[PDB]
Amino acid sequence: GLFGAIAGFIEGGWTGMIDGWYGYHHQNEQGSGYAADQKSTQNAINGITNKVNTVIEKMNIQFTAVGKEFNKLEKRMENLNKKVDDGFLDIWTYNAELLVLLENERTLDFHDSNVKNLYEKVKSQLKNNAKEIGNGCFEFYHKCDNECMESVRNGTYDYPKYSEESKLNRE
Amino acid sequence: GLFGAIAGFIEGGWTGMIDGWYGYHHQNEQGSGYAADQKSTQNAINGITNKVNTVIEKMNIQFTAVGKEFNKLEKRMENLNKKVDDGFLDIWTYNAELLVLLENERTLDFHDSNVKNLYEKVKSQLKNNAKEIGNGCFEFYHKCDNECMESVRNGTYDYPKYSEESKLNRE
Amino acid sequence: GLFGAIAGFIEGGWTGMIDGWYGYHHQNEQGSGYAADQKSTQNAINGITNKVNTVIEKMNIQFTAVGKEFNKLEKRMENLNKKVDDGFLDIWTYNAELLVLLENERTLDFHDSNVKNLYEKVKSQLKNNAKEIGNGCFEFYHKCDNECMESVRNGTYDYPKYSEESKLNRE
Amino acid sequence: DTICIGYHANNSTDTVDTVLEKNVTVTHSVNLLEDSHNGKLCRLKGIAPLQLGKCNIAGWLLGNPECDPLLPVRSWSYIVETPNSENGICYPGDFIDYEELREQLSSVSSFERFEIFPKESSWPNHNTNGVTAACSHEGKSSFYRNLLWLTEKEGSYPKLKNSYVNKKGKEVLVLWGIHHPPNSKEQQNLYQNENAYVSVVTSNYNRRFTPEIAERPKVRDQAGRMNYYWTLLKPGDTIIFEANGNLIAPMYAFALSRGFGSGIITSNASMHECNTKCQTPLGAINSSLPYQNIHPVTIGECPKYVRSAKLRMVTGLRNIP
Amino acid sequence: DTICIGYHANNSTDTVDTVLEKNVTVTHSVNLLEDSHNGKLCRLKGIAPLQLGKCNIAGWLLGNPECDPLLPVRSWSYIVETPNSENGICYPGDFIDYEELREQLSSVSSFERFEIFPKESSWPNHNTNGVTAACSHEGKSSFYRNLLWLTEKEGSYPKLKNSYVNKKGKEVLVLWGIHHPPNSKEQQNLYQNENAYVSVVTSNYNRRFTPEIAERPKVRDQAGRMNYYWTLLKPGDTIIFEANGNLIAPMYAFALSRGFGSGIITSNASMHECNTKCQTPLGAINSSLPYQNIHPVTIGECPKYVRSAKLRMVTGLRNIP
Amino acid sequence: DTICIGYHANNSTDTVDTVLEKNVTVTHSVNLLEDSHNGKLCRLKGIAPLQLGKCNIAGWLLGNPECDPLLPVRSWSYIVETPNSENGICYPGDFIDYEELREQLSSVSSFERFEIFPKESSWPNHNTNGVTAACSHEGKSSFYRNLLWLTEKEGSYPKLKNSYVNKKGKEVLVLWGIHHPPNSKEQQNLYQNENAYVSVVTSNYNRRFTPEIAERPKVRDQAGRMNYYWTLLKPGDTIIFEANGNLIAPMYAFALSRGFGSGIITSNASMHECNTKCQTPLGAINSSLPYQNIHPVTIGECPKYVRSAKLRMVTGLRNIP
Ligand SMILES: *[C@@H]1O[C@H](CO)[C@@H](O[C@@H]2O[C@H](CO)[C@@H](O[C@@H]3O[C@H](CO)[C@@H](O)[C@H](O)[C@@H]3O)[C@H](O)[C@H]2NC(C)=O)[C@H](O)[C@H]1NC(C)=O
Ligand SMILES: *[C@@H]1O[C@H](CO)[C@@H](O[C@@H]2O[C@H](CO)[C@@H](O[C@@H]3O[C@H](CO)[C@@H](O)[C@H](O)[C@@H]3O)[C@H](O)[C@H]2NC(C)=O)[C@H](O)[C@H]1NC(C)=O
Ligand SMILES: *[C@@H]1O[C@H](CO)[C@@H](O[C@@H]2O[C@H](CO)[C@@H](O[C@@H]3O[C@H](CO)[C@@H](O)[C@H](O)[C@@H]3O)[C@H](O)[C@H]2NC(C)=O)[C@H](O)[C@H]1NC(C)=O
Ligand SMILES: CN(C)[C@H]1CCN([S@@](=O)(F)=Nc2ccc(C(=O)N3CCO[C@@H](c4ccccc4)C3)c(Cl)c2)C1
Ligand SMILES: CN(C)[C@H]1CCN([S@@](=O)(F)=Nc2ccc(C(=O)N3CCO[C@@H](c4ccccc4)C3)c(Cl)c2)C1
Ligand SMILES: CN(C)[C@H]1CCN([S@@](=O)(F)=Nc2ccc(C(=O)N3CCO[C@@H](c4ccccc4)C3)c(Cl)c2)C1
Numbered sequence A, B, C: 001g002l003f004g005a006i007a008g009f010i011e012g013g014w015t016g017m018i019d020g021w022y023g024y025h026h027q028n029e030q031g032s033g034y035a036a037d038q039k040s041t042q043n044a045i046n047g048i049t050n051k052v053n054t055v056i057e058k059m060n061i062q063f064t065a066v067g068k069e070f071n072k073l074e075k076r077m078e079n080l081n082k083k084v085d086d087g088f089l090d091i092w093t094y095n096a097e098l099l100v101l102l103e104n105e106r107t108l109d110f111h112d113s114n115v116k117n118l119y120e121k122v123k124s125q126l127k128n129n130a131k132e133i134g135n136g137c138f139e140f141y142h143k144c145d146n147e148c149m150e151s152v153r154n155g156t157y158d159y160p161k162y163s164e165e166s167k168l169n170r171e
Numbered sequence D, E, F: 001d002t003i004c005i006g007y008h009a010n011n012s013t014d015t016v017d018t019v020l021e022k023n024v025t026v027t028h029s030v031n032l033l034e035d036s037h038n039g040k041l042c043r044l045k046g047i048a049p050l051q052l053g054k055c056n057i058a059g060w061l062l063g064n065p066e067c068d069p070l071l072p073v074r075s076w077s078y079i080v081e082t083p084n085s086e087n088g089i090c091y092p093g094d095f096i097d098y099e100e101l102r103e104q105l106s107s108v109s110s111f112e113r114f115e116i117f118p119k120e121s122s123w124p125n126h127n128t129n130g131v132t133a134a135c136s137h138e139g140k141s142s143f144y145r146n147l148l149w150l151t152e153k154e155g156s157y158p159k160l161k162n163s164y165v166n167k168k169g170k171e172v173l174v175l176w177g178i179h180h181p182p183n184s185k186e187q188q189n190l191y192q193n194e195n196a197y198v199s200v201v202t203s204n205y206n207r208r209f210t211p212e213i214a215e216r217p218k219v220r221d222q223a224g225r226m227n228y229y230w231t232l233l234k235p236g237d238t239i240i241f242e243a244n245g246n247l248i249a250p251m252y253a254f255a256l257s258r259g260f261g262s263g264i265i266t267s268n269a270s271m272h273e274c275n276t277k278c279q280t281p282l283g284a285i286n287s288s289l290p291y292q293n294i295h296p297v298t299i300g301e302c303p304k305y306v307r308s309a310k311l312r313m314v315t316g317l318r319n320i321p
């Protein structure tokens, strides 16, 4: 994708995370589990629901539209009516297919951006207290319990609390 | 936004910076102040002015366009004239509203990108001579006077000049 | 650009790299040379070829479309035929010019993204075994022969293999 | 201890297309194209259509005797013609401005069939019993139910003169015909005058008709012709018929009510006890989707017709399990 | 010591919409939709319009006496009709190809009203003083200013024959009428011949008119009818009128100049001493914006009409003070 | 030791436009707008066009003698008229529904010119040798090749009656004319009857024509007029002509075949030994591009016409050597 996260440095998705589009997987002495980031998922849902509604609202309802009849001496008028009907159908088919293609590309890039931004938020919090092991995973240089993991997930990670221990194990 | 700077890791804007769209705030022993980045602001202004002019230029001027009259035995032709007028109005209203919505989304993402790129330019210059304290701010590990601040703003920061002092205070 | 690589922190392009859109230049004791990244270039080629084909496929072939004749007592019908022909021409000219402008902007941003993602892939591999010297170049803290360079290019760089030597020269 | 950043995946096999890539499998998606219909003719917004059965518009308005007679008053939301309407005009000729009349009926929501000139009161000095084998009924010669073939009585065709004042408060559609015999011997036999004429006048209509006699190729075994004419009589206006021959006089007229959103369609589907907001000649559509690919002809509040086979917008992510 | 990266904010309350989000407050924005007009009829590119006042197109061209007479020569940029034009055709009948004539006038920029057949020189053997109560003026019976009702003189209606050669170098619009009395007694009284005819011929026009006599409903208290006809006489061409009755002869014709960008509109606004590049029936528009939502009918160089209520493009950033 | 990330550059000077920036030099690009044609009239999908030469549609169908006679049977893909077609109708008058006939011919792919009424077999009691100076040939008076001017023979004009049955299996286009002398002396001289009439009838066509005699301005030195009429005779149907004067009888008719994708264009280009899938009045287009800016009139499989001067999509990168 444009932001390099989905199908990029994060190779695959998580079937085990069913509660959201983006989230975290943790592993410490207390166990393991998946936790969706509710803030980013809900914000994305609102944006995407906005996009689909905008596409539907932009297309007015088609009210009654039937054909006309012409006698054998009105061929020019009949062909003009056909040219109008065919021309409008050409444009609306064109507009509809292109709008979906264009918005589909942006939607996938939008999801790619959210994953990258979420990744950078964690990386900017941990700093040198952890190391990038690839695949979007961080290995802590200190013990990180469930309360410590929750602090990373909600953006309140206490970096000074673990700096001394991390530096020792970072050696 | 798509690039995570505006309303992201930089929470809010600066009412005190009136001379540009993007810029710097500094704090040292000589005082504090706001300084807009003229290069990025002027480049963005040229791009945005380009976009608005392109939208206006793409819409040709509407020359004279009035209605027609039909007698009681020309109802089919009257309804064909109405179908043409309504159909064109449907398409142009559709094109106009969607173009604004699409370009508005890109314009906000364009500004988000400029802030992020400006942030990364400073970060790539300071390297380990300063530390990321969040909210888009850097705290220097050395004394940085007005001349030193100007070097960061115009891309000529002398990293080796302060490496020894920064390493000492970085301890 | 939107991602800041092309015409950004990588100032200019390489006329000496003729085998691809993105690639690497290396310099060690065994010599120097340009090597295109075949994976990213081929993927971009497939995407761009997709985009051009989609634009052409979305425009149906124009089958026979000639004018009509009207006598001196059919001026209203003649002007209706002109209004239909002019109106459709206005829309298709509008759609064609805007589609090219919009896709051209996205195409340049697409190439900018590929360079940035390629740069970040190398940076995430080398970590602290090398230093960012600007202009998109990395200076190794250890000897890196042709086999070592090939490992970076294909994503199999052995970071632990050189950590001790890099740390010594990093001093 | 480790923490990882990741994204959702599932068992979805939905695919979408983008400008850069096709057949992208995605976790969630929304279909925007309606392609399903029920295959039935339904009531539209609570009002049933007017089905003409074996008749087309021309046959119903003139009163072709081979179609089942309708109730005196009908109200509808759209008009259905069968694709093989064999019963139309039965005596050959020209229906003047027929297509314009069809366009007028496309905005009519109700009719009342009433006797404008009563059969046994309006023409005391003329014969009104004329029938033809072209408009047969049950194997016997007959004629249009709404018209009357006036001919000579006791060897004479007096100059007739009759009028009607529109006191219905709605437009009244009046139809009549002009007969053109194939030779002068028949013209004298039926109408007793060779230089005959028909005059029809209202406040805004003024036309004079004259027979044009010549031998013609047989159409439905008739060398004669009948030309059919109509006009809309405004509320409060008078129509006057004057003729000394060849007039196919009106007997029943239609008081018409104007409505919105109606139209005429051709369909072989059957009427069912169902209600819809959108009707096509193939069937009814129950959908809130913005597009459909079922039929370009629509009545009611309908999705926009497009030629596309698939219109799917991705809502979720690329699916990589 | 610290340095920070930031972006602009201000007190702006302007909002824009995006595909992903609505009611986004932004620092700077540009309105693209013109919604203001001055509510007046103005000169268009330095040329004043032709206001018909109480007349419609039909009344002005025929010369209805209830409208103020115009100057012999006028040049305009557009034509204004009032929504309640009571003065049009005053003697009831049909204006043949009236809508086509209106379309022709939409590309006319000037007229010269000149005497094609002088009143006291062209018809020495016919009475030209005919007037009717339908075309009244100041409570007295009158007639069209551009036409002449020819009737019998001294009990005789000689077969007239008059012609005009177009030496104006521009198209000449000629109008005439045909009278249809309601009974043969009046036809003989006015024109002395029962089988009368009117012939009008040019190099490209060739039509013959014959009266059609019948009793008709009273329209403006007249059971008779007058049918109005017109043709465009090409430069250098001749028109010949031949009749032995029922001709409403032309007296004044119009030499027409062709222009570009003109049209006919209906408006109740008043003319003002102003100049504009864009005129709508509601008022004039002074704007460089690409869109407007004021009126779909426009004359001049105008923004494109759309149904939208708001079209605002953001130029600045999201505003977060 | 160093490793660097970079991108391609070359000597390309191609420029593209974006919404944010114009005159962007790019490494690779694709032109989408076809602006080249060969300037010749070519065969379309292997079929040569029908070139009318000095004739227009009217002159060819009536058989103006100043044009080179065509082969009895022709099949074509499109019809070419020259911009200065001087040879059309040579005897002045009106070609009724001429534009409708042109529209019919736009979907015709073949004709067979055959004798519907043989010259020396169909009119034994009438003179068929009438010629006029208006339709001259080699400096001598002549007449249309497909029509016959019937006049009196031995001081008498018997009431003629002739018919043709369509046994061609295709529609037959029949053309005829009606002559209007400028005075009654000539009407009696040519046709011996003053109250003459012409009748033409088929199963779906029924019209009666009557001369209208008056002095008219000279057009091509003729004060008389000839009105031209046509009808399409359905397969298996009969057409009957009945007249006692003024009939310009048909002699040759056209059996027509229906096709797809054809049309009529005006062009001064010359026919060449070439083949194309797309033909414009300026020349043929050989291209797979989606757009063209050569001409809005196209025949065949053609790119879409747009007003743009440049439509270039970038495929490569911004070029910064
Ligand atoms: C369009 O996108 C779909 C979504 O993935 C593609 O469908 C998948 O295509 C593969 C290959 O044709 C199908 O078969 C698989 O092939 C391997 C090779 O032998 C076989 O061992 C597997 O067991 C499997 O059958 C796969 O079932 C199919 N998945 C579906 C239909 O859900 C498709 O190929 C794309 N392209 C087109 C042109 O449709
Ligand atoms: C559309 O966008 C505008 C731009 O912000 C929104 O306008 C603002 O809406 C709030 C809430 O309705 C207004 O009232 C505020 O509410 C708090 C709660 O009590 C009150 O204490 C504040 O003093 C303030 O009055 C606010 O004034 C208003 N700002 C404006 C109009 O400039 C608006 O809500 C958005 N939505 C819609 C549907 O318009
Ligand atoms: C459109 O984009 C093209 C692509 O670069 C621009 O073309 C280049 O423009 C420059 C300046 O007009 C040309 O001249 C150069 O100027 C310097 C100044 O003296 C001179 O020393 C150089 O030797 C050189 O001649 C340059 O040749 C030209 N390159 C081309 C045509 O390939 C162009 O300016 C842009 N703008 C417009 C309005 O076309
Ligand atoms: C006329 N109809 C068809 C229209 C009218 C407008 N809507 S609507 O805009 F709401 N459509 C959709 C349809 C689907 C979605 C979507 O992907 N999910 C819904 C929210 O949980 C998401 C989720 C589920 C599991 C795990 C993680 C995330 C999945 C969205 Cl976001 C919007 C439909
Ligand atoms: C037909 N009319 C309406 C059209 C014709 C084309 N133009 S135009 O394209 F120039 N429009 C605009 C309108 C506004 C802007 C804009 O945001 N600022 C102007 C430049 O200083 C910016 C600034 C101000 C203070 C601090 C920081 C930055 C604000 C721009 Cl960039 C373009 C208008
Ligand atoms: C109707 N015609 C005109 C259409 C039908 C569809 N195609 S097509 O989509 F294939 N067009 C193009 C045209 C050009 C390109 C392109 O930039 N390069 C081709 C691949 O090597 C690229 C390269 C070369 C040297 C060094 C590095 C990279 C250059 C592409 Cl990617 C697609 C044309």
Ligand SMILES: *[C@@H]1O[C@H](CO)[C@@H](O)[C@H](O)[C@H]1NC(C)=O
Residues within 6 Å of the ligand: A147, A148, A150, A151, A154, A156
């Ligand atoms: C974040 O999680 C921590 C648990 O470590 C908790 O103490 C804190 O209150 C949470 N903050 C928010 C804003 O939820």
Ligand SMILES: *[C@@H]1O[C@H](CO)[C@@H](O)[C@H](O)[C@H]1NC(C)=O
Residues within 6 Å of the ligand: B147, B148, B150, B151, B154, B156
């Ligand atoms: C950048 O600022 C420094 C001040 O520290 C100054 O010496 C230098 O000349 C400036 N460079 C540019 C290109 O403006």
Ligand SMILES: *[C@@H]1O[C@H](CO)[C@@H](O)[C@H](O)[C@H]1NC(C)=O
Residues within 6 Å of the ligand: C147, C148, C150, C151, C154, C156
């Ligand atoms: C990558 O390059 C190295 C050379 O250092 C080679 O040993 C390895 O097999 C390569 N891997 C792939 C997947 O090409």
